[PDB]
From a paper:
In this process, small GTPase Rab5 functions as a master regulator of the early endosomal biogenesis. Rabex-5 is a specific GEF for Rab5, Rab17, and Rab21. Rabaptin-5 is a key effector of Rab5 and plays an important role in both homotypic and heterotypic fusions of early endosomes. The GEF activity of Rabex-5 is autoinhibited by its CC domain and is activated by the binding of Rabaptin-5 via its C2-1 domain.
Author numbering:
A (entry chain C): 552 to 634
B (entry chain D): 558 to 632
C (entry chain G): 552 to 635
D (entry chain H): 553 to 634
E (entry chain E): 134 to 309, 318 to 437
F (entry chain A): 134 to 198, 200 to 437
G (entry chain B): 20 to 40, 51 to 182
H (entry chain F): 21 to 25, 34 to 41, 53 to 60, 70 to 88, 93 to 101, 104 to 133, 141 to 156, 158 to 182
The structure:
Amino acid sequence: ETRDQVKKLQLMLRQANDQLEKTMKDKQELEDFIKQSSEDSSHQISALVLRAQASEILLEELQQGLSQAKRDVQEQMAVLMQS
Amino acid sequence: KKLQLMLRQANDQLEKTMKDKQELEDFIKQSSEDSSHQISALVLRAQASEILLEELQQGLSQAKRDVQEQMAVLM
Amino acid sequence: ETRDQVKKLQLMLRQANDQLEKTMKDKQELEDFIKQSSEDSSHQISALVLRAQASEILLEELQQGLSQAKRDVQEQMAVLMQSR
Amino acid sequence: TRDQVKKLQLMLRQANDQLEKTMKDKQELEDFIKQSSEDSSHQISALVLRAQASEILLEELQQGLSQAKRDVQEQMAVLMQS
Amino acid sequence: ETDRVSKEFIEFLKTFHKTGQEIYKQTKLFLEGMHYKRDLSIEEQSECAQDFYHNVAERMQTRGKVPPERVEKIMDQIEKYIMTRLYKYVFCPETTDDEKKDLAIQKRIRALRWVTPQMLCVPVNEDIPEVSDMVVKAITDIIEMDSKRVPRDKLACITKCSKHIFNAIKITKNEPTLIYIVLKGNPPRLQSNIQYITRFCNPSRLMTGEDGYYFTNLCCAVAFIEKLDAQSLNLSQEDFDRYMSGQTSPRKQMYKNLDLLSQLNERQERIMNEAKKLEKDLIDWTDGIAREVQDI
Amino acid sequence: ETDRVSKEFIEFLKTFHKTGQEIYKQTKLFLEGMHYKRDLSIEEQSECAQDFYHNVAERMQTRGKPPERVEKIMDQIEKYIMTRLYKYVFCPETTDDEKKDLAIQKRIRALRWVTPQMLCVPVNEDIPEVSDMVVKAITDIIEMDSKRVPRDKLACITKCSKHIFNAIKITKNEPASADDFLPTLIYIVLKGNPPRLQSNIQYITRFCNPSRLMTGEDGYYFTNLCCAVAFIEKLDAQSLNLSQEDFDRYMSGQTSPRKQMYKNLDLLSQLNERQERIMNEAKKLEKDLIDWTDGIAREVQDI
Amino acid sequence: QFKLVLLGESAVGKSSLVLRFSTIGAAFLTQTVCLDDTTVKFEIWDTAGQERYHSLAPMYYRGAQAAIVVYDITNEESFARAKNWVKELQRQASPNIVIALSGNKADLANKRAVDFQEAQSYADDNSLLFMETSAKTSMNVNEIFMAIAKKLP
Amino acid sequence: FKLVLSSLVLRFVIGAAFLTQKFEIWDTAGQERYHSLAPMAQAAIVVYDNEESFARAKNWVKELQRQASPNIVIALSGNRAVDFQEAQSYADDNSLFMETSAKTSMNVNEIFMAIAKKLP
């Protein structure tokens, strides 16, 4: 019985070590995954909205600017209309 | 005999390392969740800034038709 | 009749001219305002998130980073029971 | 007379079309800032949320160490004995 | 102005070599009439013109014997020549309240900017890029009607509009409203446009043509909104009064948002640093526990 | 710490030249017993604990003889025991405590998606202070495990629920009913993933003086607490006012790990590509526009 | 001591009425009253007016010695909620319990939807304490309270 | 002529409201809210399915008989919970009426082809 206890014990230990060894890999890997990952989340996201609000607005200068060129050019037909 | 103690040892350190990993996990799901809700809200703004943009592009391409019909009306 | 009329017309035209004037100042200012608003909205906002999703990590690698460092000294006191 | 009022009523009519457009214009730009402010808005709190959660993780952490300096100190207090 | 169109029509009526003259002179006759009446009172301005409607329509048919299958299209071309010269004269007459009630609408709508559709329970969901993609145009087609002087292009703007409107129903519910599109749009120079239609639209185009049904239900929606009340919403006055106090507060959200921000940077700048302190304050344990034992 | 209370406790009873001894030796006798009995049925464990509580409670009145005063002693006595005893009595190996402690830890772990739009909690965390006391209630339920004794514990319960009422009041400015309250604390627990949660609770239920639990401030808090909790395990879409669709949805195709950042990572490149697109198109009419205006200006300015 | 529980439908003043009975937030009360030289003190459980958490009441009330069910008079629904609360009460709450019900928001009764004689009818049909109350004018409050108190041993 | 009225006019003839057959037919909104301001018509109908539909049809014909121009002809549509004998007693008390089914297209062609030959 003693020696059976010793095989089954050698099984639990070898198997468990390949497995521990696995988890230390997966884990340490993974932190490396997210570190750089949330870096890309971040860096990108900021560079991104900076484009939104620096750009999505750039257009109402037009939102108003078209309505002016529509009022002045509707006017030129009036600058001609007395002529 | 001695194998059973070293095996207790073969377990516990792993179970600890299991903590380290499992925490990391909950975490990235969540930074990830949060990011998520932001990117959905960001897309949502971007494409609106696009709608007013085709809205205007066509509105000028029409106003050229407007000046062409009206200056056709005056000469 | 004209003497009744012309008062009222010089009236609406004057009031309303001052009114145009209101709405004119108001818009040009309000817009100048918002252009600024996106600016101090963004520069800060990104300088906020960007520090954030990358700064709130530091605490994460520390929560995980303790448990082996606690394991280090916990293992370290084990060297002592033999030194007895 | 008809110069004094007809042509005047026309001048008013146009100055009025005119206010109309500028009023339209402002309220458009204005409605807009309300929208940019809205979409910033729903988000800004989710922006707070990661901040304070990652304020909490730091207080619980500062706390657990505030425990472990006490623990290794008591444990080395158990070692100093004969 | 007077030249070129003088040409397009003289080119136009001679095609018959029969009826070509009759229309021309009758026209310039009632024309001098209505331009004489340009200074005459407004209600008094429309009359010999709609008279001219019914009167031409009858005068030509009894004597002329021409197939009306093509008249379906004749209803269209006629309005251009008249409205071009007359716009200056009859659009927003100084005699009327047109300008004034245009401002009634502009102000009212602006003041209603706080209302949302879920209370009307209109059969839409604008969340979809598509239904709202047509929401935008829905808003713009009713707008451009004012850009064009003629009632043809105008009623074409109304019709095209009413048409791209139920499709939001077809994208969201998928079943084959009025109040919702106008109220977000705030349409320019409305009353004198509306009326430009009333006086100078073809009464028949109001009877048979779709533009008629569209237009009719529109003014229903308009006169509805003008006195729009609590009971068409089914909501109480205690809060209602609050809503009449005014929610205008425009720059305000951004003002408040913009306050918070720097205390929040203040929150995280109020973080990184102690964690950086806790970096150092940390190893000093680990190394400290290291040095003191490395002795023995 | 198994070291230290031996001093503090004595410092308390030393004023008594009469009953101090009278209770003390009496206690440590059967208490000496409980180290031997550590192997007996757990139910029997809390049993001779609740017995010894109640028994001194009668006996002192029998020989030594006011209940106005008891609530204040009830802390100290149990303090001395739990200091040596926590180790034997927390989360029994014989019991399922450990098991449901992890069941719940995962249960709440999966709760990362929650907003009080679903629950309608009457709080607004946007104000710095409000979130500061929010954080504190959480810091309290976290710190709840730290305490070896259940008095310090029950005080973390109270104190937490207190930082919750506080935020309730600053956010509302009307105080809170439990219409305005339960979903709050749940909002805090949900945010706590609280440690050794289950076995802490049961350590209390089984080990603490029941009167300080029935009469004391602590009773209502711990109660509505466990309620909030065992409710959280048994949860309804229709109690969230949610269809079976969302209820299944947020947990059904998700919880695949790390994928979320991947998806987010794809998306993110998609959008930034789009805003580069829109911008450069508006630049197309930056130019393509003016040439109409000045073009209708100059090309027509001729005659 | 003496244990009582408070149940109701939400915002019905489940909040309010006790509150009037400004430093902290609205907890359980622990109020001391005596109609005699001997003193009786109270314990009071604030419970979910919110309807989905209307599910867990069992342990709130378990060891408790008294009880209360709130219904609004301008919302007959809160009154029906009240009736079901009663049937549940007599059945699965420790039948040792003592009962009392009232209609509230008695300040705006130009808006009243729940009939006095009807609710007193349903009350006195199951032998209930019934005199309706207001929190704003505070009418039968302490009255309905000494009424409460003449019952406990 | 102009007729004033979801699925029953769908079996007979893009837009839900207007359908040209001249049958110039206009369609009403299912909501109870904006009920007034109805009149522009020389023909009219009234539709019910729920006994509330019946009731609304009652106050609806009670709006119609009073307000309109005198000439217009009306027609009623069933679309169980109510006796037909009741509906028909009501209908003949006030003088064309029928029950209709569009999935089989029962009286779908009919009510229109009977409304047409009525108008002078």
